[PDB]
Amino acid sequence: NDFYDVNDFFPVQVDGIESSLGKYEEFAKDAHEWESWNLQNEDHPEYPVKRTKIRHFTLNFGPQHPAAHGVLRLILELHGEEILRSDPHVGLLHRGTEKLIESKTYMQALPYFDRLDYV
């Protein structure tokens, strides 16, 4: 689901567990203490392992980075040092040029274009 998550060898039918001093059910109400009496091996692929979904290291290649040519919140999701998913967050410099040009003449709208690319 959202917060946590939960074969080759034959499924082997074994029933009628017995010891030398009785049956499995005779000492069932006492064997939880006995760690050597458990019937759920930990190598089984179907063994119930319930582990929380701890999110991966998501460094922010954020606005305050010299590599950034502006203000870019580059949300990088990385495991180890490889790159899994990248979601750039543009808009930290949305001055709304397209909205302002609609209210200014064709001569007055020219200086807006020099401010698109600084170079």
């Binding site: 999110r55 998501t58 460094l59 922010n60 290649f61 954020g62 606005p63 305050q64 980075h65 919140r73």
Partner: peptide
């Protein structure tokens, strides 16, 4: 902590 300005986990 410093995280380029924006808070993270």
């Amino acid at each position: 902590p410093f995280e380029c300005g924006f808070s993270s986990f």
